């Protein structure tokens, strides 16, 4: 109707904060976790996929995600944002702000994937994959959940993207990691993080930008933004402590990387929940997500026998699943949440959540498989072994990170 300038302001700043999560947050987070000879490949992959996603989003992605269409995609009425008047309002903000805000979600989702592919993927293969997967997985899942499609029509609860973002990315990453195979040296050689302060810096930036991600998903600077903000603080803090105490108890020491990973686990877990639950719910989701993440990167990783160097699946997939499920519990009025929709019971909501999770996993997994196969058929997924030994920075990018 009319744009509220307070909401315009809030939502432009929230968008900058989400963009900050990718540029540089996720780049530094994954960059620090891998070896020095490969850091620039991670930074370049995040930066160039970011740029590609931004362009594909304005060309067709936003239209097909958020346009009215069927249960699975929108339309092509907003190609290059044509047919959107500058003064057009979506909710209580200019639609152009909505375009940017939702585009930033596309970016972080894709940035998340590359941590699974690190150190042996061919750069051109990543770009081809992204084009396929953004178009056929991100866009339809966004439409299904947030653009009025199938899952929305069933009353799925996902405030800021446990499905659309975290599970979606985690599955794409996991399928990628299986398809390209284990790094050379995998079971015998040491892969320590090359720069833990760099990982911490990335964690911190992800955390700060996440307020934009979670609170901005209210679309307005109202009481639900406030609820989501506070739930984000609490859930993150609870997960850090959950992880640390699990680690300290079971392995003997509280660690920096543990504390960072716990933060992320909580942020992921509370993502679907943050605008539907109460603070006691956020605390519980946090502790659970922290411990679930810890399990995810230790025992589950061993079970899966996959090389996901940045544990994208163990954190984003596991904690996204936990969060999506717990949202269907803690939304209850009796548990301090905002309440189920008319005619909906807890049992019915849990089923809807599980259905949404299942559909996301299969949809993303099938699409990711297709994208990676296309990349493999055109350019080849995996670099030659000797390029992998020397490192991708020199071989794919012609640069060394640190020059004395």
């Amino acid at each position: 109707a009319v744009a509220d300038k307070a909401d315009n302001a809030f939502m432009m700043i929230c968008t900058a904060l989400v963009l900050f999560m990718t540029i540089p947050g996720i780049a530094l987070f994954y960059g620090g976790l891998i070896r020095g000879k490969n850091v620039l490949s991670m930074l370049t992959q995040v930066t160039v996929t970011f740029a590609l996603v931004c362009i594909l989003w304005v060309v067709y992605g936003y239209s097909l995600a958020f346009g009215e269409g069927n249960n699975f995609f929108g339309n092509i009425n907003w190609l290059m944002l044509k047919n959107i008047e500058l003064t057009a309002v979506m909710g209580s903000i200019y639609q152009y702000i909505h375009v940017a805000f939702q585009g930033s979600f596309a970016c972080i989702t894709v940035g998340l994937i590359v941590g699974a592919l690190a150190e042996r993927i061919r750069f051109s293969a990543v770009l081809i994959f992204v084009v396929v997967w953004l178009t056929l997985s991100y866009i339809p899942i966004a439409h299904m959940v947030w653009g009025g499609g199938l899952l929305a029509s069933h009353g799925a609860l996902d405030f800021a993207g446990g499905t659309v973002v975290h599970i979606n990315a985690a599955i794409a990453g996991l399928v990628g990691a299986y398809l390209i195979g284990k790094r050379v040296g995998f079971g015998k050689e040491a892969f320590k993080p090359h720069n833990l302060p760099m990982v911490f810096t990335g964690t911190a930036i992800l955390y700060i930008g996440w307020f934009g991600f979670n609170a901005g998903s209210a679309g307005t600077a109202n009481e639900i933004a406030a609820l989501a903000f506070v739930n984000t603080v609490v859930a993150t803090a609870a997960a850090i402590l959950g992880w640390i105490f699990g680690e300290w108890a079971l392995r003997g020491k509280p660690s920096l990387l543990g504390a960072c990973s716990g933060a992320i686990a909580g942020l992921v877990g509370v993502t679907p929940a943050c605008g539907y639950i109460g603070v006691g719910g956020a605390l519980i989701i946090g502790v659970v997500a922290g411990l679930a993440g810890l399990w995810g990167v230790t025992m589950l990783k061993r079970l899966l026998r996959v090389d996901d160097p940045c544990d994208v699946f163990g954190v984003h997939g596991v904690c996204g699943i936990v969060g999506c499920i717990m949202t269907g519990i803690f939304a209850a009025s009796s548990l301090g949440g905002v309440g189920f929709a008319e005619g909906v019971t807890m049992g019915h909501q849990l089923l809807v959540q599980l259905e949404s999770i299942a559909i996301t996993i299969v949809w993303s997994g099938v699409v990711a498989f297709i994208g990676y196969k296309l990349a493999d058929l055109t350019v080849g997924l995996r670099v030659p072994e000797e390029q992998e030994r020397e490192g991708l920075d020199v071989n794919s990018h012609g640069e060394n990170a640190y020059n004395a």
Binding site: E189, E390, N400
Partner: protein, 113 residues
């Protein structure tokens, strides 16, 4: 009759070389990060307008003091463990040590290792 054996190898062969040495009763040694130039040469690097066609390769240098009676076996065990067959596998150097002292105890030669 004490020798210093220096080995310049590809960094990923370090663990293999260490395990081979420990297998014959040699666990004590010193490692240095070094930069190597030779038959194997670095890829070109480009930074905006700047082109660098001459670049070093990272290598690992192991220095291990041993008794003369261990030398031939060390050479053999290290050569096998460091081997890949591709250019750049590196070199073994051997020099005499006149003295080897353990600072803590003052033990000398074989007893200092």
């Amino acid at each position: 009759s004490m020798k210093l054996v220096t080995v310049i190898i590809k960094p990923f062969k370090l663990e293999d070389v260490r395990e081979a040495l420990s297998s014959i009763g040699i666990q004590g040694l010193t490692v240095t990060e070094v930069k190597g130039f030779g038959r194997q040469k670095g890829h070109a690097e480009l930074y905006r307008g700047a082109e660098f066609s001459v670049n070093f390769l990272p290598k690992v240098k192991i220095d291990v003091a041993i008794a003369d009676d261990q030398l031939d076996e060390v050479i053999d065990i290290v050569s096998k463990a460091a081997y890949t067959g591709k250019i750049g596998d590196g070199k073994i150097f051997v020099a005499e040590l006149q003295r080897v002292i353990r600072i803590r105890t003052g033990e000398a030669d074989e007893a200092a290792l």
